[PDB]
Structures are given as structure tokens and as C-alpha cells.
Amino acid sequence: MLTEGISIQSYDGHTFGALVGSPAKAPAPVIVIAQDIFGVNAFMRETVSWLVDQGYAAVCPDLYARQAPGTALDPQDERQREQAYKLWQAFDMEAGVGDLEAAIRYARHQPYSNGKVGLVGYSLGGALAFLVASKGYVDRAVGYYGVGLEKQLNKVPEVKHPALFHMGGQDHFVPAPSRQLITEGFGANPLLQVHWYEEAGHSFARTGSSGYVASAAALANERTLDFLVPLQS
Numbered sequence: 483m484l485t486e487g488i489s490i491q492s493y494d495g496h497t498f499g500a501l502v503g504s505p506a507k508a509p510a511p512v513i514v515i516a517q518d519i520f521g522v523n524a525f526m527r528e529t530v531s532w533l534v535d536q537g538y539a540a541v542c543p544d545l546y547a548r549q550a551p552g553t554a555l556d557p558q559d560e561r562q563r564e565q566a567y568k569l570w571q572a573f574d575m576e577a578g579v580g581d582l583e584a585a586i587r588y589a590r591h592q593p594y595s596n597g598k599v600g601l602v603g604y605s606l607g608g609a610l611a612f613l614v615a616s617k618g619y620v621d622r623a624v625g626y627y628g629v630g631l632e633k634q635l636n637k638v639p640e641v642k643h644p645a646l647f648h649m650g651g652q653d654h655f656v657p658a659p660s661r662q663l664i665t666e667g668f669g670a671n672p673l674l675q676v677h678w679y680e681e682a683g684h685s686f687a688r689t690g691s692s693g694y695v696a697s698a699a700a701l702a703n704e705r706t707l708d709f710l711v712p713l714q715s
Contacts, residue, residue, distance in 0.1 A: 483501060483522060483523075483527060483554060484499040484500060484501050484522055484544055484552060485499070485500065485501055485502045488500045488501075488502050488541075490541075490543060490581075490584050490585050490588045491584060492577075492580050492581050492583075492584040493580055493583075493584065494577075494580065496547070496548060496577075496581070497547075498543055498544045498545070498547035498548075498551070498581060499543070499544045499547065499551070499552070500522070500541050500542055500543040500544060500585060501522045501526060501527060501530055501540075501541075501542040502530075502539070502540065502541050502542075503530040503531065503533070503534040503539060503540045504534070504539040504592075504593075504594040505534050505537050505538060505539060505594070507537060508539065508593070508594035508595075508596075509594060509595055509596035509597075509715065510537055510538055510539050510594055510595075510596055510714070510715075511538055511539075511595075511596050511597075511598040511599065511600060511621075511710070511713030511714055511715075512538065512539040512540065512541060512589035512590075512592065512594070512595050512596075512598075512599050512600075513533050513538045513539070513540045513541070513589075513599070513600045513601065513602055513710065514540075514541050514542075514543065514582060514585045514586050514589055514599060514600070514601045514602075514620070515529050515530065515533070515540055515541070515542040515601075515602050515603065515604075515607070516542075516545070516578075516582055516601060516602070516603030516604070516606070516607030516608075516610045516611055516614075517542060517543075517545055517546075517603075517604070517606065517607050518566075518604045518605040518606050518607055519555075519566040519567065519569060519570040519573075519605065519606045520553075520554070520555040520556070520557055520562070520566045521544070521545075521546050521552075521553035521554045521555055521566075521569075522542050522543075522544055522552075522554055523554040523555060523556070523557075524554075524556070525557075525604075525688050525690075526542045528688075528689075529542065529602070529604075530542055532703075533602070536707055537714065538600075538710070538713075539589075539592070539594045539595065541585055541588065541589050543581055543582065543584075543585040545573075545578050545581055545582070545610075546569055546573075547581075548574065548577055548581075549569055549572060549573070550569065553565075553569065557688075557690075557691070558690070570606060573606070575609070575610070575613065578606075578610050579610060579613045579614055579617065582601065582610055582614050582619070583614065583617065583619045586599050586601065586614075586619045586620050596713075596714075596715045598621050598713035598714075599620050599621060599713070600620060600621055600622040600623065600624070600710045600713050601614055601615075601619075601620045601622070601623045601624065602623075602624045602625075602626070602706060602710075603623075603624070603625050603626070603628070604625075604626045604627065604685075604687075604688075605626070605627050605628065605629055605655075605684065605685070606629065607625070607626075607628075608625030608626050608627055608628025608629070608631075608647065609625070609628045609629050609630050609631060609634075611623045611624060611625035611628060611645065611647075612625055612628055612631055612634060612637070612641075612645065612647070613634065613637070615641050615643065615645035616634070616637035616640040616641055617640075618640075618641075618642050618643055620643065621643055621713055622643065622644050622645070622646070622709060622710055622712070622713060623643070623644070623645040623646070624645070624646045624647070624648075624706050624709060624710070625645070625646070625647045625648070626647075626648045626687055626702065627648065627649060627650055627653055627655070627656070627684050627685065627686070628647060628649075629655045629656070630655075631647070631656075631660075631664050632656070632659075632660040632663040632664050632667075635663060635664070635667035635668075638667050638668060638670055638671050638674065639670075639671065641671055641673050641674055642673065643673060644673050644674075644675075644709070645673065645674055645675070646674075646675045646676075646677075646705065646706065646709045647668070647674070647675065647676040647677070648677055648679065648687070648702040648705070648706070649661070649664075649676060649677065649678050649679070650678075650679055650682040650683045650684055650686050650693070650695075650698070651678045651679055651680035651681070651682065652680070652681065652682060652683040653682070653683045653684040653686075653693075654683070654684075655684055661678065664676060665678075675709075677702070677705065679695070679698035679701070679702065681695055681697070681698060682695040682698035682699075683695075686698045686699055686702075687699040687702055687703060
């Protein structure tokens with residue numbers, strides 16, 4: 483689901499929609515939320531609500547608009563998971579980064595904006611959060627269970643603003659060898675933080691996921707909110 487009327491334009495001209503929430507107290511910092519492979523769906527709506535309840539505005543752009551605008555898939559439905567994996571395999575990461583950079587620029591000057599912008603992404607969106615952090619588009623970036631970060635480690639020195647990553651120690655998208663590479667690589671730049679939640683796997687911060695772990699979700703979420711609060715006025 484998206485907010486009707488909201489349109490954002492990327493550098494290459496492509497336009498896309500977004501789900502937006504603004505807090506009752508504004509101006510406020512704005513968090514761009516990078517979706518997972520299911521599009522702007524119920525958990526993205528929950529993420530917008532969670533951030534708005536904490537005093538932020540939030541913008542979750544339709545990153546699948548270059549393939550199938552408005553795609554919003556149910557992670558409990560097997561056929562819709564298959565569709566999500568197929569869209570993910572065809573997803574253009576570089577265009578996704580550019581669409582997030584356009585949503586970040588948009589987020590700097592809306593009626594509710596205080597001018598500061600953060601980014602929070604989940605899985606596909608956590609990989610995109612690291613790429614965006616390597617470009618410097620945002621003030622602060624956060625990735626939950628980003629996939630494939632061990633293949634992007636040459637970008638560690640390019641991160642020049644803080645970026646926080648929450649990883650499950652039982653997430654087999656990030657097996658022991660990958661966890662060691664990321665831990666060693668990220669450790670060279672103090673602007674990066676990566677925490678490992680040893681009793682949690684993938685999607686551990688989504689309440690309806692089979693991977694949900696309330697203690698790890700709560701610790702990671704409070705660390706995300708502590709990390710974003712400097713953006714507040």
C-alpha cells in the first residue's frame with residue numbers, strides 16, 4: 483500500500499510512489515525505509531507506524547516500481563514468496579540505490595521535514611542501506627539482516643557517516659565465514675557498528691515472522707532509536 487498522490491523522481495527520470503507517515507509534532511527528521519523483497523507491505527506499514535509513534539516522519543518508497551509498481555506481497559503466502567524471490571533476482575541494485583537517494587532528497591524538504599534524514603532497511607533493504615551509506619546520501623543508516631554484505635567490503639572506507647547493522651547469529655544468509663569477513667572488515671571504520679544477536683535468525687524483528695525473537699527485536703529496535711535520535715531537533 484502506498485500513499486496516494488505521493489511521487490518521487492529519480493535522477494534518470496523514473497518516478498515512483500511511497501507510503502508516507504508524518505508525526506503530530508513537526509518539523510521532524512524523516513526516515514526513508516528501504517523495503518525487503520515483498521514490496522511496501524504490511525510490515526512496511528508497521529515500520530512507518532513504529533517510527534511515527536517515536537516522533538519521526540517516514541517515507542517507504544516503491545522500489546519495485548521499475549518492475550511491477552505497487553507490489554505488496556504477503557510473506558505467509560507461499561506463492562507470493564515465490565513471486566518475491568523472482569522480483570528480487572531481477573532487482574537492479576544500482577537503480578534501487580538511486581531511487582533511495584531520490585527519496586532521501588525528497589525527505590529533506592517536505593512540510594514536515596526538519597532537514598535531517600535517516601535510512602532504515604530490512605534484508606534487501608539492509609544491503610541497500612550499506613550501499614547508500616557508502617555514497618554518503620544520508621545522515622545515518624541502519625540495516626536489519628542485510629544480505630550479501632561480505633561481497634561489498636571494499637566499500638567500508640567510503641562510509642563517512644554512521645551506519646548501524648543488526649545481524650542474526652542464526653541467520654544463514656550470513657553464515658560463519660561471511661560473519662567473520664563482515665566483522666573484520668567493518669571493524670576498520672568506527673562509523674560502522676555491527677551487532678550479532680546470537681539467538682536470532684533472519685527477520686527477527688517482524689512479529690509475525692517464523693524468525694521473530696522478541697528479545698532480539700527489542701534490543702535491536704532500541705539501539706536503532708538511540709542511533710537515530712541525534713537527527714531530532
